Swiss-Prot record, chain B:
It comes from the Eukaryota. This is Voltage-dependent calcium channel subunit alpha-2/delta-1. Skeletal muscle. The chain holds residues 146 to 241 of 1106 of the full protein. It comes from Oryctolagus cuniculus. It is found in: Membrane; Cell membrane. Binds gabapentin, an antiepileptic drug. Proteolytically processed into subunits alpha-2-1 and delta-1 that are disulfide-linked.
UniProtKB/Swiss-Prot annotation, chain C:
Pore-forming, alpha-1S subunit of the voltage-gated calcium channel that gives rise to L-type calcium currents in skeletal muscle. Calcium channels containing the alpha-1S subunit play an important role in excitation-contraction coupling in skeletal muscle via their interaction with RYR1, which triggers Ca(2+) release from the sarcplasmic reticulum and ultimately results in muscle contraction. Long-lasting (L-type) calcium channels belong to the 'high-voltage activated' (HVA) group. Phosphorylated. Phosphorylation by PKA activates the calcium channel. Both the minor and major forms are phosphorylated in vitro by PKA. The chain holds residues 962 to 1009 of 1873 of the full protein. This is Voltage-dependent L-type calcium channel subunit alpha-1S. Belongs to the calcium channel alpha-1 subunit (TC 1.A.1.11) family. CACNA1S subfamily. It is found in: Cell membrane, Sarcolemma, T-tubule.
Amino acid sequence: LPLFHIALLVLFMVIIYAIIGLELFKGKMHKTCYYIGTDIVATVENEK
Amino acid sequence: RIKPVFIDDANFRRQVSYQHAAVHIPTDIYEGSTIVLNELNWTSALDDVFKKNREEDPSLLWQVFGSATGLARYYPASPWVDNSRTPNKIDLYDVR
Amino acid sequence: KMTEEECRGYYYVYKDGDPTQMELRPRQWIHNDFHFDNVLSAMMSLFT
Amino acid sequence: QPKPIGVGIPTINLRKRRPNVQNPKSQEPVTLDFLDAELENDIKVEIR
């Protein structure tokens, strides 16, 4: 019963940061390093 | 190892050495197991038969003993077409 | 390979899990980084 | 001739072939039937 206001303060910080990130980084992480003329994404041993 | 002399021949469009027999071991088989080093120890008695077969009929092409451990001992000695990693083409040849 | 006498030589790895796209790698008997051999190593591991 | 016997039509996928992965070449024998090396009559079948 007492943890109400803190949860209501977290629910709006998540909502504010979601909208900020939606403004700034929307549709930016969509290109990557493919092999030339291929659909095999190029990485190294431990690189995601 | 052995550093062979490798004259160049016809009847084999490559360079062969009639002095000893060459050995092929699959790439993913260690040469240095106890099983492999025991096949290389008793197959060394084949080279006299290899040579005698070849001297009775000089028109004879490869002679090979392909062993059940992966080895292939052939005569006359001649470098394998593919070094596994010295060029970027690795070879998958298993005698079995 | 399960003992150090077997873990010698080379072996094939398959990229993307494809049986026709392989690479040679020397195989080596590797020790973990946080192991439990002595009590100092066990204590480091338990710390992490 | 000194070339492998072909089966079907070949279809390669460029977009799935890494540049340096050493795909195997061939191991099949050259088994060319008799009635596929000449024109096939009803008499050549009986000779065969």
